[PDB]
Amino acid sequence: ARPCIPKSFGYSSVVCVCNATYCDSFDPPTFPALGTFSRYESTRSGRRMELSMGPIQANHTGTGLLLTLQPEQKFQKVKGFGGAMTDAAALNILALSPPAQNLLLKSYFSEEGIGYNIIRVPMASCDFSIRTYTYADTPDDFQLHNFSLPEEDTKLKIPLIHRALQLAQRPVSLLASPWTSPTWLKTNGAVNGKGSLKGQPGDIYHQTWARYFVKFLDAYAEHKLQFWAVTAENEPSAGLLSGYPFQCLGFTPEHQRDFIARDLGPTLANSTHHNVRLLMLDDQRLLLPHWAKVVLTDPEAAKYVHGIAVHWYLDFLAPAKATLGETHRLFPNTMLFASEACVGSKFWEQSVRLGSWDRGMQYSHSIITNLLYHVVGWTDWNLALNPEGGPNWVRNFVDSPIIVDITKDTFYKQPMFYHLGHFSKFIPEGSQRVGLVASQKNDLDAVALMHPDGSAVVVVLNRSSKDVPLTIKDPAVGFLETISPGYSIHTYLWRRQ
Amino acid sequence: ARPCIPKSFGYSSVVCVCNATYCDSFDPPTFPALGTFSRYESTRSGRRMELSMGPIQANHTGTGLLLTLQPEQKFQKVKGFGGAMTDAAALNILALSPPAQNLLLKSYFSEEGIGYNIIRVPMASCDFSIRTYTYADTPDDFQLHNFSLPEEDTKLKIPLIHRALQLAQRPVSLLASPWTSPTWLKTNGAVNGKGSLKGQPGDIYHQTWARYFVKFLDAYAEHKLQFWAVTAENEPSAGLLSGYPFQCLGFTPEHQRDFIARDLGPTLANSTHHNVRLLMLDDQRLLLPHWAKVVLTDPEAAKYVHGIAVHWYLDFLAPAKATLGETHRLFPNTMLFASEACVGSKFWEQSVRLGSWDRGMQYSHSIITNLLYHVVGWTDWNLALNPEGGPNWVRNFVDSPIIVDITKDTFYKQPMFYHLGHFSKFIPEGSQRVGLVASQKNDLDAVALMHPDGSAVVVVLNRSSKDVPLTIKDPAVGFLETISPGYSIHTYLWRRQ
Ligand SMILES: *[C@@H]1O[C@H](CO)[C@@H](O[C@@H]2O[C@H](CO)[C@@H](O[C@@H]3O[C@H](CO)[C@@H](O)[C@H](O)[C@@H]3O)[C@H](O)[C@H]2NC(C)=O)[C@H](O)[C@H]1NC(C)=O
Ligand SMILES: *[C@@H]1O[C@H](CO)[C@@H](O[C@@H]2O[C@H](CO)[C@@H](O[C@@H]3O[C@H](CO)[C@@H](O)[C@H](O)[C@@H]3O)[C@H](O)[C@H]2NC(C)=O)[C@H](O)[C@H]1NC(C)=O
Ligand SMILES: *[C@@H]1[C@H](O)[C@@H](O)[C@H](O)[C@@H](Cn2cc(CCCCC3=C4C(C)=CC(C)=[N+]4[B-](F)(F)n4c(C)cc(C)c43)nn2)[C@H]1O
Ligand SMILES: CCn1cc(CCCCC2=C3C(C)=CC(C)=[N+]3[B-](F)(F)n3c(C)cc(C)c32)nn1
Ligand SMILES: *[C@@H]1O[C@H](CO)[C@@H](O)[C@H](O)[C@H]1NC(C)=O
Numbered sequence: 001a002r003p004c005i006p007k008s009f010g011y012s013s014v015v016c017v018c019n020a021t022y023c024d025s026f027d028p029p030t031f032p033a034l035g036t037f038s039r040y041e042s043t044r045s046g047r048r049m050e051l052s053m054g055p056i057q058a059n060h061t062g063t064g065l066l067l068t069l070q071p072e073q074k075f076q077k078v079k080g081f082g083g084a085m086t087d088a089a090a091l092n093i094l095a096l097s098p099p100a101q102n103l104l105l106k107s108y109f110s111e112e113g114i115g116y117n118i119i120r121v122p123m124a125s126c127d128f129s130i131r132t133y134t135y136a137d138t139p140d141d142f143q144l145h146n147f148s149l150p151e152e153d154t155k156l157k158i159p160l161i162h163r164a165l166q167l168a169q170r171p172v173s174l175l176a177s178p179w180t181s182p183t184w185l186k187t188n189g190a191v192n193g194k195g196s197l198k199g200q201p202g203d204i205y206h207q208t209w210a211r212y213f214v215k216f217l218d219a220y221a222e223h224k225l226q227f228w229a230v231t232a233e234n235e236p237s238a239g240l241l242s243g244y245p246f247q248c249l250g251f252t253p254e255h256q257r258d259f260i261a262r263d264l265g266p267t268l269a270n271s272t273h274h275n276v277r278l279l280m281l282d283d284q285r286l287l288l289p290h291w292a293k294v295v296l297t298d299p300e301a302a303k304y305v306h307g308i309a310v311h312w313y314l315d316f317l318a319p320a321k322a323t324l325g326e327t328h329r330l331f332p333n334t335m336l337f338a339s340e341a342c343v344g345s346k347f348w349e350q351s352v353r354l355g356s357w358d359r360g361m362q363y364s365h366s367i368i369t370n371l372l373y374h375v376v377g378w379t380d381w382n383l384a385l386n387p388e389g390g391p392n393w394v395r396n397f398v399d400s401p402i403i404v405d406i407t408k409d410t411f412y413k414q415p416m417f418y419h420l421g422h423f424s425k426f427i428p429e430g431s432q433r434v435g436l437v438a439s440q441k442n443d444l445d446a447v448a449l450m451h452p453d454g455s456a457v458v459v460v461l462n463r464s465s466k467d468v469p470l471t472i473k474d475p476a477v478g479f480l481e482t483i484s485p486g487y488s489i490h491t492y493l494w495r496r497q
Numbered sequence: 498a499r500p501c502i503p504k505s506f507g508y509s510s511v512v513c514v515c516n517a518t519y520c521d522s523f524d525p526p527t528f529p530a531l532g533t534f535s536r537y538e539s540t541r542s543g544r545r546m547e548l549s550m551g552p553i554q555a556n557h558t559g560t561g562l563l564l565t566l567q568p569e570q571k572f573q574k575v576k577g578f579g580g581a582m583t584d585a586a587a588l589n590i591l592a593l594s595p596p597a598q599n600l601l602l603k604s605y606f607s608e609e610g611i612g613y614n615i616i617r618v619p620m621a622s623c624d625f626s627i628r629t630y631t632y633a634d635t636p637d638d639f640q641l642h643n644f645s646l647p648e649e650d651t652k653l654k655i656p657l658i659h660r661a662l663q664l665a666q667r668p669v670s671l672l673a674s675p676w677t678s679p680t681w682l683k684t685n686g687a688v689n690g691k692g693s694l695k696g697q698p699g700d701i702y703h704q705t706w707a708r709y710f711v712k713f714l715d716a717y718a719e720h721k722l723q724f725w726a727v728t729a730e731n732e733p734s735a736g737l738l739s740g741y742p743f744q745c746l747g748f749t750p751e752h753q754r755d756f757i758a759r760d761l762g763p764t765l766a767n768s769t770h771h772n773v774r775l776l777m778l779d780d781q782r783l784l785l786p787h788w789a790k791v792v793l794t795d796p797e798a799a800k801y802v803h804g805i806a807v808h809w810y811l812d813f814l815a816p817a818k819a820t821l822g823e824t825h826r827l828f829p830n831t832m833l834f835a836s837e838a839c840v841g842s843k844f845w846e847q848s849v850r851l852g853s854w855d856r857g858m859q860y861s862h863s864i865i866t867n868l869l870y871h872v873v874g875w876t877d878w879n880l881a882l883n884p885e886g887g888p889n890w891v892r893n894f895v896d897s898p899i900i901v902d903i904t905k906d907t908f909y910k911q912p913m914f915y916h917l918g919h920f921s922k923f924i925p926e927g928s929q930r931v932g933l934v935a936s937q938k939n940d941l942d943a944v945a946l947m948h949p950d951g952s953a954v955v956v957v958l959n960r961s962s963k964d965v966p967l968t969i970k971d972p973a974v975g976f977l978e979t980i981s982p983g984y985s986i987h988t989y990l991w992r993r994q
């Protein structure tokens with residue numbers, strides 16, 4: 001119903017400008033007639049998920065690129081897509097006027113926007129916090145009598161999550177992850193640096209830390225929120241590195257294995273939260289398959305573990321086939337889920353590049369590669385940051401698909417927002433990846449899925465300068481004659497019956 | 498002979514001060530009689546490779562820690578230990594007056610110092626250069642008619658290497674590694690950032706790049722320097738990373754496999770440099786065993802690969818057993834070699850902490866862990882730097898075992914120098930790692946080797962604050978009653994007949 005109001009900040013593409021009275025949005029989602037396809041197109045040149053339509057034709061001739069759907073060749077079911085409601089994200093959202101807040105939440109969570117169905121919720125403070133805290137900072141509280149949620153949860157995160165749910169048409173799944181334990185549970189007695197839980201799995205320190213997960217889930221439940229899943233620790237490898245600058249808790253894979261087997265698994269299993277899924281790793285995929293082997297070859301750990309969460313920061317040297325591919329082959333019934341990504345974290349990168357097409361293409365390239373290697377979901381980091389890429393108590397500034405500009409009561413929707421939307425809007429929970437065979441080698445990135453209802457979705461990313469004409473064959477419905485412009489991303493949808 | 502002149506800069510231990518007229522040194526070995534052991538001790542409290550002696554007794558009784566040599570259990574033979582003659586290292590050494598220069602070189606290379614037998618030589622510029630350059634910057638010079646050594650080699654590096662080889666009584670092995678090719682051979686046309694050789698292995702670009710290696714070895718041979726080994730690329734993974742800040746050349750392990758098989762192996766084999774060893778990887782050991790499997794399962798690549806070079810920067814998430822152990826199991830006739838280490842490279846670390854005992858324990862802990870997982874040698878990075886940790890054209894400053902202060906015609910020998918010396922001085926080329934078993938759980942890091950002459954060498958590191966009394970048993974000679982003070986490192990020597 002409303003188009004992108006474009007603005008250039010001198011980077012390769014534009015942001016879309018939203019404020020208290022205006023934000024780009026969609027009409028109610030509908031499938032066209034049997035025999036018709038919808039194309040959504042975004043381009044570096046400025047198109048933002050523009051809707052066009054074409055006929056599905058009876059026949060096709062030529063030697064051009066042909067992508068044939070393999071509807072009967074079935075892979076993983078999708079869980080979903082979304083982002084992280086950090087302290088930083090919550091502060092940036094609530095710094096907007098209430099009507100601008102509502103257009104930002106509708107951008108992410110409504111069918112008028114891109115239909116996020118995953119929110120990652122830090123358990124207490126991380127780097128994207130302005131205050132260092134846990135839920136149990138009173139020392140030697142082993143029974144966790146003094147556990148409680150501060151205002152960061154009760155006044156900021158929890159209301160924003162309810163407002164997100166209220167706007168959503170599809171069930172939203174909450175994912176919880178801790179960065180640090182209380183410092184009195186740790187070898188080094190600090191939120192950051194090299195340090196693990198004191199003692200060993202099975203002891204008072206580890207039982208207290210597992211009970212903290214149940215206390216967290218009890219407190220959010222008091223505020224009428226339920227979790228889909230928790231992770232065993234955010235980036236457990238971080239706490240093994242001397243001087244790690246922010247909140248962390250170190251586990252070797254053996255320590256994670258034994259923590260899960262002895263404390264976290266049983267403690268959750270014997271709680272009212274027994275249905276909350278447990279994900280292991282929550283770390284760089286180069287740790288696979290070794291970490292999957294250590295944890296899941298212990299049957300007493302494996303029986304508690306639903307899935308393996310991965311972060312994208314070292315993908316450059318962790319080939320998909322050797323990490324995701326090999327983990328799937330060894331442990332096919334243990335889902336893989338991407339739980340954290342962002343651009344701008346390198347010291348030689350600027351934190352925020354308003355309108356960066358490169359950063360959009362990093363997102364869609366990552367999502368396609370994950371989907372081609374069995375991953376069930378992909379989660380962004382901060383839902384929103386300021387133009388500095390903050391706030392962040394260690395000035396570890398990064399980029400976000402939405403940048404809030406409080407002085408103008410304005411927010412900017414970057415290419416990353418639309419590139420993630422090409423997936424999140426059009427691939428509902430329960431969608432299954434299906435095969436998509438290329439007639440010839442090509443520079444395109446493409447993935448096909450089937451909606452639970454049986455309808456088809458295909459995403460085609462062109463990271464080249466060259467226009468590529470192509471045809472998509474649905475061996476049962478007919479042929480889509482199309483073209484993939486240079487520096488474009490398309491989502492195609494069509495009913496099959 | 499001449500003891501350490503200690504100086505504190507307010508860190509956990511002292512540096513040893515050297516200038517034009519004074520530097521700490523060793524007497525020549527006295528080779529103590531059968532039934533006598535030598536101990537060299539370094540402590541955080543200020544002892545620097547101090548020599549003591551004790552008896553070996555026929556019997557022992559007690560329940561304290563026993564370390565038993567198993568001389569019938571034979572593992573890898575040692576190639577040796579050393580560091581890198583970077584542009585920055587050479588500029589720092591030549592910034593001293595000649596007598597001070599010679600005391601620095603004797604500290605590393607002479608029998609009055611710590612007997613280094615390895616020098617890593619960058620092939621043209623890296624981050625520890627003040628100028629960016631390769632040996633063939635004239636574009637499209639495919640037959641490399643314009644290949645030449647500049648003054649960084651002909652005036653600075655080559656003359657220093659000649660001076661170091663002359664001062665050494667042990668044969669010194671040179672190791673060459675390139676950071677970048679000429680920009681006109683690269684996809685990105687820059688010395689840094691994401692970019693590989695143009696085209697594919699077997700083509701004009703790859704043939705030119707293989708020839709460059711032979712042109713390099715030809716030029717150094719014109720100066721009567723021969724190499725023991727070359728690496729296939731310094732950190733090939735770095736050129737797979739967007740915005741990589743300094744000189745690099747990206748290879749996937751497949752690209753490395755096919756470059757070695759088609760270009761570098763054949764081109765070296767068909768040259769006067771056919772005896773120069775080729776080491777693969779030259780990168781983080783977390784890339785093992787995957788990279789070893791990719792390259793060494795291709796017999797046409799495997800036949801040219803002598804060894805696997807590893808760097809230490811991601812050791813924190815790459816456990817020795819799962820990387821070095823698994824690689825040796827799968828490929829036991831392919832040696833493992835540590836080719837690059839340094840401290841201070843983390844964004845949240847000071848580059849140089851003069852007197853840091855922590856940085857010394859990091860070197861010795863790494864060397865012991867490497868030796869216990871079949872590694873045949875250990876190579877430091879810059880031989881010397883200034884107090885800032887440079888110079889460095891991208892201001893990527895780090896620490897070095899020797900820090901040169903121009904303004905005082907003075908250099909400081911740091912704990913890292915003495916921690917490396919506890920191995921390099923006492924473990925010559927041809928030493929063999931033997932079994933060493935503990936009677937109980939203990940916090941000590943220990944390794945035993947047999948000198949080519951049959952004498953024993955045991956290094957014991959205590960990274961704990963607690964003194965640990967202990968006994969070393971050699972079945973051929975008896976028992977050494979000793980103590981490992983907290984924050985100490987010992988090297989024990991004794992004759993076995
Ligand atoms: C929130 O953003 C909206 C969208 O930009 C703002 O609305 C817009 O206000 C500008 C300035 O009045 C309008 O500009 C002009 O357009 C007309 C023709 O369309 C042109 O003749 C003028 O020279 C001028 O360029 C713009 O049309 C208008 N857009 C819409 C969709 O209404 C709005 O003012 C912002 N709200 C707040 C609270 O700041
Ligand atoms: C090079 O380094 C050496 C070692 O630090 C410097 O030697 C030290 O020089 C000072 C200044 O002369 C000496 O001070 C004195 O010691 C005598 C006793 O021997 C005392 O009676 C004097 O009144 C004075 O305190 C110091 O002892 C000496 N140490 C050693 C081990 O020789 C040397 O001066 C430095 N040279 C240059 C050119 O920088
Ligand atoms: C996820 C966290 O949970 C969030 O708290 C955080 O905000 C977010 C963003 N982020 C990412 C980082 C840096 C991670 C990787 C750094 C890394 C690299 C990389 C990318 C290249 C090279 C080389 N290295 B490395 F040198 F090998 N290296 C070492 C030695 C250690 C680390 C961490 C890396 N910081 N904030 C996510 O972290
Ligand atoms: C259990 C599944 N589910 C569905 C929904 C959507 C409706 C959210 C309504 C809501 C609530 C609710 C239900 C509880 C609290 C504290 N708030 B709430 F106070 F956080 N809140 C605010 C501030 C606004 C709203 C609309 C709201 N939420 N959870
Ligand atoms: C912790 O909880 C106990 C039990 O309710 C209470 O008596 C005590 O005062 C609390 N301590 C705090 C909040 O420091």
Ligand SMILES: *[C@@H]1O[C@H](CO)[C@@H](O)[C@H](O)[C@H]1NC(C)=O
Pocket residue numbers: 635642643
């Ligand atoms: C390259 O080499 C040729 C000699 O073969 C020489 O004449 C030419 O000037 C060289 N080019 C440069 C730029 O030095």
Ligand SMILES: *[C@@H]1O[C@H](CO)[C@@H](O)[C@H](O)[C@H]1NC(C)=O
Pocket residue numbers: 766767768769
């Ligand atoms: C290398 O192979 C070539 C054939 O291309 C041959 O002429 C030459 O003599 C060989 N050289 C050496 C040193 O093996």
